From Swiss-Prot:
The gene is rpoD. The chain holds residues 439 to 526 of 613 of the full protein. Residues 20-88 are annotated as: Sigma-70 factor domain-3. Sigma factors are initiation factors that promote the attachment of RNA polymerase to specific initiation sites and are then released. This sigma factor is the primary sigma factor during exponential growth. Preferentially transcribes genes associated with fast growth, such as ribosomal operons, other protein-synthesis related genes, rRNA- and tRNA-encoding genes and prfB. This is RNA polymerase sigma factor RpoD. It is found in: Cytoplasm.
Length: 88
DNA sequence: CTTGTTATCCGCTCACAATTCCACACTAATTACGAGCCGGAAGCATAAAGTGTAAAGCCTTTTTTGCCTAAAATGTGATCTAGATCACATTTATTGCG
């Protein structure tokens, strides 16, 4: 059961380490918060990890749902999320 | 007395929101980690036949330039006849009328 939901979980394919890299930076964020009491700035963790600081920000942009289309916005009658995007 | 079909009743699954535009403002949580593995590509220089580009090297043709000068076009001004100019004063000939 940990093999099937290990890849084909979301509606779209998702890598393995891409979801294992999130909780990796989690069990350390509160680790420095329970001691010092301040938010771990992207400077001290840049020396303990293999990620610089710039490219690591674009990684979070990938980790999403992202979002459906047939979802009410304002009119809640005929207006849909995928009905406001112009065509090229 | 027992049996049937029929009528009334209930809860159930079922089908089923319709006055008409716009503006302003606002918004998201969660599956244990570490070591070892094969994967793609970082873009490396290579090298070749093949291709299409990019110097400017004398030829030929066009086009502006300066040229010469033979032949045709161009002022000199004082005198002199054939031309022109105005305004609005007065005189003239047109077709009819009576």
């Amino acid at each position: 059961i940990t093999r099937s939901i290990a890849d084909q979980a979301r509606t779209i394919r998702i890598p393995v380490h891409m979801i294992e890299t999130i909780n990796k930076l989690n069990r350390i964020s509160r680790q420095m918060l329970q001691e010092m009491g301040r938010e771990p700035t992207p400077e001290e963790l840049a020396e303990r990890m293999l990620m610089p600081e710039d490219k690591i920000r674009k990684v979070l942009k990938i980790a999403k749902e992202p979002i459906s289309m047939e979802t009410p916005i304002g009119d809640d009658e005929d207006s849909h999320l995928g009905d406001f995007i112009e065509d090229t």
